[PDB]
Design a protein around this ligand. Sequence first.
Ligand code: CLA
Ligand code: CLA
Ligand code: CLA
Ligand code: CLA
Ligand code: CLA
Ligand SMILES: CC1=C(/C=C/C(C)=C/C=C/C(C)=C/C=C/C=C(C)/C=C/C=C(C)/C=C/C2=C(C)CCCC2(C)C)C(C)(C)CCC1
Ligand SMILES: CC1=C(C/C=C(\C)CCC[C@H](C)CCC[C@H](C)CCCC(C)C)C(=O)c2ccccc2C1=O
Ligand code: SF4
Ligand code: SF4
Lengths: 107, 31, 141, 61, 29, 96, 80, 739, 30
Amino acid sequence: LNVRPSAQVVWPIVGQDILNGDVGGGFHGIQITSGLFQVWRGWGITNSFQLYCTAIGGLVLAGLFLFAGWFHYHKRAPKLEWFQNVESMLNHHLQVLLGCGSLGWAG
Amino acid sequence: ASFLSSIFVPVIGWVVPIATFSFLFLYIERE
Amino acid sequence: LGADLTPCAENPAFQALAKNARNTTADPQSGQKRFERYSQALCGPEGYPHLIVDGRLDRAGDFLIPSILFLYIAGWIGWVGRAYLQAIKKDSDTEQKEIQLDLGIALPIIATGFAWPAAAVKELLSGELTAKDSEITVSPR
Amino acid sequence: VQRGSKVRILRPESYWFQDVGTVASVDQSGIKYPVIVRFDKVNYAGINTNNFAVDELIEVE
Amino acid sequence: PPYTFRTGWALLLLAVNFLVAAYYFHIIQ
Amino acid sequence: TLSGKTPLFAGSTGGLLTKAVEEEKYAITWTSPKAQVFELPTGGAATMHEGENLLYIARKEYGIALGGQLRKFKITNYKIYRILPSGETTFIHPAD
Amino acid sequence: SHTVKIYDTCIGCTQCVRACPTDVLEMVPWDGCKAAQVASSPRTEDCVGCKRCETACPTDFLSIRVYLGAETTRSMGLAY
Amino acid sequence: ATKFPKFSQDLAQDPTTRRIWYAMAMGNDFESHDGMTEENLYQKIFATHFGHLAIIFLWASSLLFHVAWQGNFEQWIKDPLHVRPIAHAIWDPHFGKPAIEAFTQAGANGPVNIAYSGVYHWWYTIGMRTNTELYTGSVFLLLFASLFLFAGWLHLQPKFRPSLAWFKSAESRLNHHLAGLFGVSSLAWAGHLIHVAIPESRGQHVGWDNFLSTAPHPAGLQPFFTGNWGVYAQNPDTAGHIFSTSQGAGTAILTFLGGFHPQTESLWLTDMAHHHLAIAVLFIVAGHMYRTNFGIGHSIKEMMNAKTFFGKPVEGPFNMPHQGIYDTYNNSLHFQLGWHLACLGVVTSWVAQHMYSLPSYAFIAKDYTTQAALYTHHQYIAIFLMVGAFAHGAIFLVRDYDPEQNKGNVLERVLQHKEAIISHLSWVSLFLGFHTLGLYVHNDVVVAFGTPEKQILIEPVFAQFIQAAHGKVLYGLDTLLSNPDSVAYTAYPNYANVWLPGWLDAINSGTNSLFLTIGPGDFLVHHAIALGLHTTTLILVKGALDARGSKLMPDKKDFGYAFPCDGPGRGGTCDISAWDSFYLSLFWALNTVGWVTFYWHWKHLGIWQGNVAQFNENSTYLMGWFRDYLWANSAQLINGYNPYGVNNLSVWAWMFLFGHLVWATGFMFLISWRGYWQELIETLVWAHERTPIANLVRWKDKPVALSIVQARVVGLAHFTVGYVLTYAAFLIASTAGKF
Amino acid sequence: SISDTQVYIALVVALIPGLLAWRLATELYK
Ligand code: CLA
Ligand code: CLA
Ligand code: CLA
Ligand code: CLA
Ligand code: CLA
Ligand SMILES: CC1=C(/C=C/C(C)=C/C=C/C(C)=C/C=C/C=C(C)/C=C/C=C(C)/C=C/C2=C(C)CCCC2(C)C)C(C)(C)CCC1
Ligand SMILES: CC1=C(C/C=C(\C)CCC[C@H](C)CCC[C@H](C)CCCC(C)C)C(=O)c2ccccc2C1=O
Ligand code: SF4
Ligand code: SF4
């Protein structure tokens, strides 16, 4: 109710340290408006270490997407008829991505 | 004689464009 | 003097701005060391240093000193870029070397040209600086 | 002139006016502009060749 | 050629530029 | 006369207009090897017949834009007439 | 209509005849150029001012030129 | 196939609605009409010039009649410093009763419009005192405008119609117009001041009845012919002269005090009388110079074609080839029209620069909104006269110019090195813009970071000097009429500085607009003005010089002045014509005069309110312009009508929104171009021939979209009208709501 | 202000340029 959501501490070089204003809580920074503190509380994150292992876990998950883009093009690329299985695509993407994604999140 | 505003302003507001436009429309469309 | 210019060290408006200094960098006295150097300028009725671009040798730090420091650098940006376009014109590709820099030719051009006032007079006095007007394309009059 | 001679252009409406060309081929009888000059820089249309008269050029080699 | 008529009037006008600056630098009063 | 078949389409809102009654009207004839689907310059798809066809078009621009579309069907026989409202048919494409 | 001037500098490339969409242009034989034909515009009452014919001509400067003149119904491109 | 327009068979054979629009923008273009010969051209322009001349006198008579009949001029004489003038009256049927009560103002019976054009101050100065002189001068201008309407009709009849050689007699116009139109009229106005206006300035009525009996001077024309002209400069109006009364009056009619009247804060009427008298002698002498049928005088065609300076062979005058320029000015009408608009465009702004600093009208320095409007009016008039100078100068190079007659001369040598003119014009535009915008944004960031002392503030030390070389002690430069030991201060051989004690009283007071005190905020805006003058000139000169063709498109002279493009070929040629460089420049010309009139208006809002510190602090960075001038002053304006009521500013609050809408409408003609709209109208042509009842009626002209050159006119028209009306509603009501 | 009589003199005198403007604008052609 009183502490303002803030990240992005500004380097103090040219007088732009005045952008690090007092948001409350002994902390000086830019009052964010993206609402990530509501999301992280809505996820149930309590301390900082749960944010580190999520962010470090995201950097690993960003590396698997970038590796598979190399792999599924420069190494093992699909044929045409793999793409035109739109009946087979809609069954996996509606069930496993959306349905099982929201079933797991319901858990 | 401030009543002349009641007789010049509606003539220039209404009668002058109606007389002008109805002349010019029949003049530009004239073989 | 100057004019409408008392020195900043004599103004009560400048010394009132001195008591509420805002620190530029994380240096805790960077707000204070800023104003001991601005005390030699000429602050008007507001308390702000007004510069003098005249050419007076007591106000040479305003515009006389930074003009010499600029014109040495910015002419050298354009002198190096001129000498590289002379070099790559006499090559086979001449358009690969424009977007995709011939770094083995560019770096001897960059390190050389710091004596361009000793250079740029020699092309002027020999007339190699310019081109003939009978050799440049012109519009129909 | 001959295949490989640098020439210059005096046609004012041309793009390569007062520029250095290179004669690619000279014809014999017709057109009145029988000299193909392969230029090195392109005009706005993107081409770099044109036809010119015999007296239109200035040989510089 | 050494352009006598061009440089003759440019040095006349530049002498007017230097004369007004002498009033501004208190050389002449 | 002209004496050509009319291609298979359900009618368009492009079609012909009041100019076809008043000022002029064009018409393109081509003899097709078979029946297939082409495009109308009025808009949409149609179906040509086999043998001599006929399409009453609005302007001359349509028939030469159509004739380029017919060139990739191996059809280089298209002839545009100019049908005046007095009945005066003028052969205009080609020149001979 | 418009005005299509064809100068004597073209080479008989037949790129301007194959680009005018109302078929104003045609080739006539002419003993000047190497291809021995010059473009001609005998049907300039059909020209719509498109300047596709000036875009397709190789020669510098253009041998063909369209001068935009008085605009009748055929040159406005009106279907109505 | 109609017979309209009469002047063109190519337009009258147009089935579309293009026939209608191109009649309007080719109607007064007399040179492109069908069958127009050369001598028929001049004879038609000369009688047309009687038509525009008689509009001006009919216009100026309605200023007199609507003030005499509906204004409060006789009530304004009693106290000009608080009585608020009246232009005309409102008869609007659409008004509500709280909008009749809000405009019933200035002590009137009905709704009246407060005059902000200052014509009460000009008529009160020149002697007019009651409502009958205003009516008498009104009725005189009805007859004097009909004397020109008859003159234009008379000089079109066949034996009264002048020949061609009468028009091209240029040495005889210069003798008659300089001596007579300039010189006698300046002499006549000096006769009006001395006989009438200066005695009316002293409480002494001189009208048409008693001007032949009364003399302006008790000496009475005896000291004129004997050479004792110093009698005319005896005891002047003193420093306690209450205007239009006999207190502190004088007998002098030609005096040379210099400076301002102490009450009205205007120029002395005795100074203006010796002025227009001295101007009259300098012009009648100037009008006896050129050669006419009397075998004496200078000849301009011989002055151009001269090649010999005292035996020395030269190329011409100043050793510059000016041959053929006499046959270039005089034979062409677009060279003349392009020239004289530059001459009239210089003086129009030069009028405005000298009327806020040197007011010449009684009690006009204290009526603020009338003075803020007269500066901004004649500045925008000077804008169009300069853009049209280059515009009609560039019509000359396309249409009238002949390179063979003009071969080798000075106007040919400009067209040779034209790529050197445009390059160095492109340099100064970029050299100023990169470093003037750089120093505003530098000052914006520095103030925003709470450390405003890091601003780059430059004193204008080269215009500090001129104001101190004209006699301002306030800076302490101590030169040249501020140095009391100077040779220029004393006028050493003759000591005849009569003007100088009265000049130094005016320039050293802080109660006028005479040589305003300048600081670092005024440094940046004069270099921002210089950005706007060199960039508007860049567009206009480059469109003038490249008007006859260039590399991307040769032979542009074969296509006339206004043609859209040359197609999408060669990369495309959108806005290539010489008309299109007129077109781009009027965005800059309206911009630059915005800068010169935002800066004029906000420096005087500190003088008129006593707060000079608001401008000098805040005009160095661009938020202080945006906040303390645009945001803060539009609070009186926008509350002209709110859900609580109205007041007398509700027209200007409505016109301010009206100007924002005409401005924004003109973007539609400029972002969106034609071919979107012809494909939209062809669906409306369809759905009108199909609707069953509404296809009883049908067009005569086929509806087509506006042409490419046309909606650049129509787009610039909505842009310019909305640019004018927005600022003119902000200039008035932010000043007339604060006083 | 001015009297009610003087306004009608100004209107009748204004017909004299109103007639002459119609003569000039039609002598300059249609
Ligand atoms: C061009 C000059 C001019 C203008 C813009 C106005 C403007 C106005 N007059 Mg005014 N007026 C003028 C000259 C002018 N006056 C002169 C010379 C006279 C003396 C005859 C009058 C006598 C007069 C009376 C008696 C009344 C007005 C009224 C009005 C107002 C309403 C408009 C109207 O009914 O017109 C009235 C017009 C006339 C009576 C005749 C017009 C006379 C001029 C000379 C014609 C000018 C025509 C113009 C040059 C043609 C060019 C058109 C242009 C678009 C190209 C408006 C403030 C009315 C008013 O105040 O309402 C509150 C009203 O009652 N005027
Ligand atoms: C090789 C670099 C170079 C040099 C020596 C010049 C020299 C000149 N230019 Mg030019 N110019 C250049 C690059 C260069 N230009 C580029 C890249 C552009 C496109 C942005 C322009 C755009 C330009 C315009 C629009 C104008 C000039 C003008 C001028 C003249 C006056 C100086 C001036 O106003 O600077 C102008 C400088 C700029 C507008 C910006 C400079 C561009 C960058 C920042 C510098 C280039 C450095 C280069 C990339 C380094 C390469 C090094 C190499 C070893 C790889 C002068 C002949 C003016 C003129 O005609 O005056 C008579 C003029 O109006 N030039
Ligand atoms: C002495 C004789 C004489 C006089 C008085 C005139 C007068 C005039 N001639 Mg002219 N003319 C003459 C002889 C004369 N001519 C001869 C002999 C020839 C043949 C060789 C010509 C050939 C000729 C042509 C071909 C034309 C004229 C035109 C004109 C008119 C110019 C436009 C105008 O009214 O501007 C009035 C200008 C002034 C009163 C001076 C203005 C000075 C500057 C611009 C402003 C200064 C004012 C100052 C700042 C204060 C103003 C403030 C106040 C308003 C509040 C004007 C009525 C033109 C015209 O319109 O025809 C009717 C035209 O086309 N004349
Ligand atoms: C005394 C000065 C003067 C004179 C005699 C002329 C005379 C001429 N000019 Mg020129 N001109 C002038 C000043 C002058 N101009 C100025 C000051 C400019 C700069 C703005 C120009 C710019 C200019 C251009 C760019 C062109 C001309 C052209 C012409 C020629 C034909 C004019 C025409 O077709 O009118 C037709 C008139 C119109 C289309 C009028 C429409 C514009 C009106 C004024 C908009 C008004 C908006 C609206 C009424 C406001 C209502 C407000 C309300 C909503 C609240 C003619 C020789 C043209 C030409 O081809 O030359 C041969 C041409 O291309 N002139
Ligand atoms: C401190 C900050 C600062 C910054 C960021 C800039 C930034 C810029 N300046 Mg600037 N300038 C500054 C301070 C600054 N200036 C000061 C203090 C001075 C006074 C000496 C100048 C004087 C100056 C000039 C005179 C010019 C610039 C130009 C430029 C632009 C291109 C510069 C360049 O290297 O192009 C790369 C360089 C080239 C492409 C060619 C070299 C051209 C150089 C700049 C000129 C040197 C030639 C010769 C020795 C001197 C010419 C005569 C001159 C005295 C009139 C760029 C936007 C140029 C410009 O506006 O172009 C449109 C330009 O002509 N500046
Ligand atoms: C946040 C985040 C993250 C994380 C994530 C995670 C943590 C995940 C997890 C996941 C999960 C954890 C999932 C889960 C899911 C689940 C599910 C999906 C299940 C299912 C099941 C089923 C389906 C069952 C059924 C059945 C039954 C009941 C009986 C009969 C038989 C059967 C078997 C059928 C990351 C790192 C990425 C990074 C970014 C952010
Ligand atoms: C709206 C628009 C049209 C369509 C607009 C048309 C066809 C005209 C719309 C206005 C109609 C005709 C009513 C006009 C009424 C005006 C508000 C006042 C007219 C009075 C004067 C003519 C005296 C174009 O054809 C066009 C073409 C090229 C660039 C931009 C545009 C463009 O912006
Ligand atoms: S005009 Fe162009 S397209 Fe036609 S023959 Fe000549 S070069 Fe070929
Ligand atoms: S106007 Fe141009 S594009 Fe159209 S048919 Fe003629 S040559 Fe071709």
